[PDB]
Amino acid sequence: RNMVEPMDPRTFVSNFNNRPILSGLDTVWLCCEVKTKDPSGPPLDAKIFQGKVYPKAKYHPEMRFLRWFHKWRQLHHDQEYKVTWYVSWSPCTRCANSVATFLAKDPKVTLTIFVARLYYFWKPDYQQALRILAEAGATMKIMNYNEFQDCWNKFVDGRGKPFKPWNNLPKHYTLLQATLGELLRH
Amino acid sequence: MKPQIRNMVEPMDPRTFVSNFNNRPILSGLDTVWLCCEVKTKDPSGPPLDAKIFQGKVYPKAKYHPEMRFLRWFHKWRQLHHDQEYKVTWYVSWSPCTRCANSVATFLAKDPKVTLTIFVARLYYFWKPDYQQALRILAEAGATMKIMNYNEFQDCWNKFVDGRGKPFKPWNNLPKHYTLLQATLGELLRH
Ligand SMILES: [Zn+2]
Ligand SMILES: [Zn+2]
């Protein structure tokens, strides 16, 4: 969390709003944190990537993370690392495949993904994207209050001010988390 | 020239139906509940048998909640008709409160020749442990709980709405709402 260029409060509030059916958000935001196996250890690095939802998947923020992280692994000690993502939309199939491929070649990396909104949760291809990541060993969880607050504290230019939840935040969470759980069943 | 459910009921206004069965998962200012029931024999393709529309409010007292009106009506209906197995289906606009759930459960325990399927358009206060528990109380009594999807909304339209020949018109995101609600119901019934 220390020394990213933080995102501004308005960008966060707009892009991490967890209304389940939401139009006019063409942007994906990905905040990531790298740590060692140790939960008593500090963050080693942190990045914020933005990208568009449109199908030049090469520029989806998940793909930018993989490119960044690949280099980061080389330049650091070969050891087990815990990566956490907070992502405003869940990933597309292409990105899931690349992450899956990545996680297969790199078992010293374990990935936890927190998602504000499921992208196209009614469409089978984005449903499969979630299942692809699960099988590759990534956990996926819908963001609830604590994760939004964590993401606010770590990645947003909140200037000491506390996270303020928007209306129906936990209600949206209940719907989305049930839907994620359903999509990952069996 | 054949018998129809719509000839057995006093149909609701299409404006009443669109408003009350809109399946937006988080909806405020909708204090009314509509319950459409149909009674069938063991045969789902059998001729239309009986049907009734009940209305009420979500506020107490529970005694005039449509589910309680149904139970009184149906207790009487069962006496005025031949004894055999019956299957009841409800299309209900909000899911039931705990007091209604407990009363339906006791009814179902005492009349095991009756089974009940409840399709609900929306889960009422699904974030409140009391209304979550109502759902589990009904499931435990053997009621089949499902969320209304397109086919059920259409069937409800055909049978219980004053549509004047006109076809059921889906509102925006009906199937997306369905997915969210059906996952949430499944989760509340399992956990
Ligand atoms: Zn992607
Ligand atoms: Zn009730």
Numbering used by the authors:
A (entry chain F): 6 to 138, 143 to 195
B (entry chain A): 1 to 138, 143 to 195
Show passages lifted from the paper.
APOBEC3s (A3s) are deoxycytidine deaminases that have important roles in mammalian innate immune responses. Members of this family catalyze the conversion of cytosine into uracil on single-stranded DNA (ssDNA) and restrict retroviral replication and endogenous retroelements. Among all the A3s, A3G is most known for being a potent restriction factor against HIV-1.
Here, we report the high-resolution (2 Å) crystal structure of a nearly wild-type (WT) A3G-CD1 from rhesus macaque (Macaca mulatta) (rA3G-CD1). We obtained two crystal forms of the rA3G-CD1 protein under different crystallization conditions, and determined the structures to 2 Å (CD1-1) in one crystal form and 2.9 Å (CD1-2) in the other crystal form, each in different space groups and with different crystal packing interactions. However, these two structures are essentially the same, with a Cα r.m.s. deviation of about 0.54 Å, indicating that the structures from the two different crystal forms, including the surface loops, are not affected by different crystal packing or buffer conditions. Therefore, the 2 Å high-resolution structure CD1-1 was used for structural analysis and comparison with other A3s, as similar results were also seen with the 2.9 Å resolution structure CD1-2. Despite the close similarity of its core structure to other known A3 structures, rA3G-CD1 has a much more pronounced positively charged surface than any other A3. Interestingly, the positively charged residues of rA3G-CD1 are mainly distributed on one side of the molecule that is opposite the C terminus. Three major positively charged patches are formed around β2-loop-3-α2-α3 (Patch 1), loop-1-loop-7-α6 (Patch 2) and N-α1-loop-10 (Patch 3), respectively. In the crystal structure of rA3G-CD1, Y125, K128 and D130 are in close proximity, forming a compact charged interface around residue 128.
